Design a protein around this ligand. Sequence first.
Ligand SMILES: CC(=O)N[C@@H]1[C@@H](O)[C@H](O[C@@H]2O[C@H](CO)[C@H](O)[C@H](O)[C@H]2O)[C@@H](CO)O[C@@H]1O
Ligand SMILES: [Cl-]
Ligand SMILES: [Hg+2]
Ligand SMILES: [Hg+2]
Ligand SMILES: [Hg+2]
Ligand SMILES: [Hg+2]
Length: 263
Amino acid sequence: FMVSLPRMVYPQPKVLTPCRKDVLVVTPWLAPIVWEGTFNIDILNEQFRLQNTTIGLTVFAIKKYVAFLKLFLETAEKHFMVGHRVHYYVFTDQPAAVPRVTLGTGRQLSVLEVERRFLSEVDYLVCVDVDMEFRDHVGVEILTPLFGTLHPGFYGSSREAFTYERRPQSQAYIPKDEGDFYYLGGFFGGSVQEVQRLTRACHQAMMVDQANGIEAVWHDESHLNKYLLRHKPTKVLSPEYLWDQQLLGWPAVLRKLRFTAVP
Ligand SMILES: CC(=O)N[C@@H]1[C@@H](O)[C@H](O[C@@H]2O[C@H](CO)[C@H](O)[C@H](O)[C@H]2O)[C@@H](CO)O[C@@H]1O
Ligand SMILES: [Cl-]
Ligand SMILES: [Hg+2]
Ligand SMILES: [Hg+2]
Ligand SMILES: [Hg+2]
Ligand SMILES: [Hg+2]
């Protein structure tokens, strides 16, 4: 049950004025493609706060990667879901190496040394790589049952150029005449149920490949792409959500660089 939104004053949407004329803002299966300018964050914040939404953010930090936690968490505190309940889940082999980061109210962090728990603690799960930093707003506009993110190196490429697994012997196999986009393995999410279904499917597919003596060209990411090809995401995030300024610069098509690789 969703309660009524309160009176709100904002610019009237214009039916005869396209949102963006330079990019595709909706997929052929009617899933929004999230770009700056396509959403009014005030309306979305209201909708999700009225639901008392809790977002889980998971990251794996093994060995040397634990050194990326401080910047990752510090910037997440400034840009990730500010205003909503957030639960960070840090999976690491070095519990004592996790930095003591100051968190805002309503936000907590759990260190898990290396899943029904997720179902009772959060509404959505966002899974990302730790050797990154938030540089701008990453909010509720991304929340949906299942979302994938456009790889910054292939968003303007033809499917034939996508680095999908091309060997029929692999469960991640995708022929040259199939494929919508090339999604990143480093940033996906959705409801806990959908995320667990995706990870469960990926795990099983990778076990089958292993038994068959084959490893997908881009490992987990290859299987992620096969999954999202057969189970269309309900929202697709633009490259604004995972960029590498050192390697790709800052093109005009990107009004904001929200989450980026650390040089
Ligand atoms: C079109 C192209 O060759 N782009 C490459 C990127 O692919 C590459 O980033 C890697 O991409 C592969 C999949 O092709 C994996 O996702 C890997 O994890 C990425 O690091 C970048 C950086 O090497 O260089 C170009 O942009
Ligand atoms: Cl992840
Ligand atoms: Hg718009
Ligand atoms: Hg996850
Ligand atoms: Hg997997
Ligand atoms: Hg996967």
